[PDB]
Enzyme design. Structure first.
Site, PDB file in Angstrom:
ATOM      1  N   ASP A  15       0.783  -1.122  -0.006  1.00 57.58           N
ATOM      2  CA  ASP A  15      -0.101   0.039  -0.040  1.00 57.58           C
ATOM      3  C   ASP A  15       1.069   1.149   0.096  1.00 57.58           C
ATOM      4  OD1 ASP A  15      -1.917   1.921   0.749  1.00 57.58           O
ATOM      5  OD2 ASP A  15      -3.370   0.398   1.060  1.00 57.58           O
ATOM      6  N   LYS A  16       0.565   2.219  -0.892  1.00 55.37           N
ATOM      7  CA  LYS A  16       1.529   3.527  -0.855  1.00 55.37           C
ATOM      8  C   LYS A  16       1.695   4.167   0.279  1.00 55.37           C
ATOM      9  CE  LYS A  16       1.772   7.985  -2.639  1.00 55.37           C
ATOM     10  NZ  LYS A  16       0.475   8.113  -2.091  1.00 55.37           N
ATOM     11  N   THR A  17       0.522   4.963   0.966  1.00 53.29           N
ATOM     12  CA  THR A  17       0.812   6.131   1.672  1.00 53.29           C
ATOM     13  C   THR A  17       0.840   5.526   3.358  1.00 53.29           C
ATOM     14  OG1 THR A  17      -0.914   7.366   0.181  1.00 53.29           O
ATOM     15  CG2 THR A  17      -0.584   8.093   2.397  1.00 53.29           C
ATOM     16  N   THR A 163      -2.312   2.144  -4.555  1.00 53.09           N
ATOM     17  CA  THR A 163      -2.815   3.407  -3.803  1.00 53.09           C
ATOM     18  C   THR A 163      -4.119   4.075  -4.394  1.00 53.09           C
ATOM     19  OG1 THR A 163      -1.990   5.629  -3.267  1.00 53.09           O
ATOM     20  CG2 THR A 163      -1.266   4.883  -5.440  1.00 53.09           C
ATOM     21  N   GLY A 164      -4.726   4.887  -3.645  1.00 52.55           N
ATOM     22  CA  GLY A 164      -5.846   5.513  -3.896  1.00 52.55           C
ATOM     23  C   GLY A 164      -5.398   7.001  -4.569  1.00 52.55           C
ATOM     24  N   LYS A 191      -9.309  -2.397  -3.074  1.00 50.81           N
ATOM     25  CA  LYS A 191      -8.129  -2.932  -2.837  1.00 50.81           C
ATOM     26  C   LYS A 191      -7.882  -4.567  -3.043  1.00 50.81           C
ATOM     27  CE  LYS A 191      -6.060   1.050  -0.927  1.00 50.81           C
ATOM     28  NZ  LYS A 191      -5.752   1.775   0.445  1.00 50.81           N
ATOM     29  N   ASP A 209      -1.609  -1.113   6.400  1.00 51.89           N
ATOM     30  CA  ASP A 209      -1.873  -0.903   7.727  1.00 51.89           C
ATOM     31  C   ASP A 209      -2.632  -1.857   8.031  1.00 51.89           C
ATOM     32  OD1 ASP A 209      -2.093   0.875  10.074  1.00 51.89           O
ATOM     33  OD2 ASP A 209      -4.319   0.806   9.355  1.00 51.89           O
ATOM     34  N   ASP A 213      -6.204  -1.414   5.959  1.00 50.97           N
ATOM     35  CA  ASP A 213      -6.063  -2.254   4.882  1.00 50.97           C
ATOM     36  C   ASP A 213      -6.659  -3.835   4.823  1.00 50.97           C
ATOM     37  OD1 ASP A 213      -3.250  -0.436   4.014  1.00 50.97           O
ATOM     38  OD2 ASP A 213      -5.164  -0.132   3.284  1.00 50.97           O
TER      39      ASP A 213
END
Length: 261
Positions: A15-17, A163-164, A191, A209, A213
């Site tokens: 996941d990116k952020t 990512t969103g 996702k 997370d 997630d």
């Protein structure tokens, strides 16, 4: 048996952020147009020192990082829909958004489009009504992240990201990291389905997370929750990493390939 089966991983999706990135804005570029970058930053931060806007705070933080003292601003004004303005040293300075620039009909130097193409958020510094510089910001890549990905590719693992965030930001991160693939504009309920799409080919991990997630970690062959800390516990995911160090993903795979129980 999560550790045990990590050895057979073929793909890892991050996941990116907050995971590959710090999860907050910071300054990536300061660009002066016949004006020094140090002065540009010091001026922009002096003007920005009152603001609660997340981008303004990141400009001030960067001035703190470089140890630049702020200057008291005279005739200070905040203009919602533009930015901020004040006099510093007998010149009228402003820090404004690309939206204000376009509304005033001001020409932005052709080089600034490259920053926009990286999905960076740009602010303009005006001096007496002319563009004196720009400051660009991004949700910045963790120092550990480049090495997290190279270690994984070195052992044959395909490295991906979801990512969103928009496709410009996602492309920029992917290129900086040398990711094998990425998916942008993925809302939180979408996702899990992207993990299943990668699963059509690969024994796949999801790293993210533990709370936010949850579904994606659940869909994965190995769900890895990262940055869980030593305070509150994550009970759904397959493996939990206390710290937020994405290089620990390869450490799990490499040790699992050397061992069995």
């Amino acid at each position: 048996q999560a550790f045990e089966r990590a050895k057979d991983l073929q793909a890892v999706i991050f996941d990116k952020t907050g995971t590959l990135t710090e999860g907050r804005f910071g300054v990536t570029d300061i660009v002066g147009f016949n004006h020094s970058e140090d002065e540009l930053l010091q001026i922009a931060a002096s003007l920005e020192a009152r603001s609660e806007h997340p981008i303004a705070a990141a400009i001030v933080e960067e001035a703190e990082k470089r140890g630049f003292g702020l200057t008291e601003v005279e005739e200070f004004r905040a203009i919602p829909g533009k930015g901020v303005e004040g006099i510093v040293n007998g010149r009228r300075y402003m820090v404004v958004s690309p939206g204000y620039i376009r509304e005033l009909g001001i020409k932005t130097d052709e080089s600034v489009e490259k920053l926009k193409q990286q999905g960076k958020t740009v602010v303009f510094i005006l001096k007496n009504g002319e563009v004196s510089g720009v400051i660009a910001l991004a949700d910045r890549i963790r120092p550990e992240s480049r090495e997290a990905i190279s270690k994984l590719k070195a052992i044959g693992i395909k490295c991906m990201m979801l990512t969103g965030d928009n496709r410009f930001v996602a492309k920029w991160v992917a290129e900086e990291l040398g990711l094998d693939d990425y998916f942008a504009e993925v809302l939180p309920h979408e996702k899990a389905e992207k993990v299943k799409e990668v699963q059509q080919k690969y024994v796949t991990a999801m790293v993210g997370d533990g709370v936010n997630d949850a579904p994606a970690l659940a869909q994965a062959d190995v769900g890895i929750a990262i940055g869980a800390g030593t305070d509150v516990a994550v009970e759904t995911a397959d493996i939990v990493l206390v710290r937020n160090d994405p290089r620990d993903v390869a450490a799990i795979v490499e040790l699992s390939r050397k061992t069995y129980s």
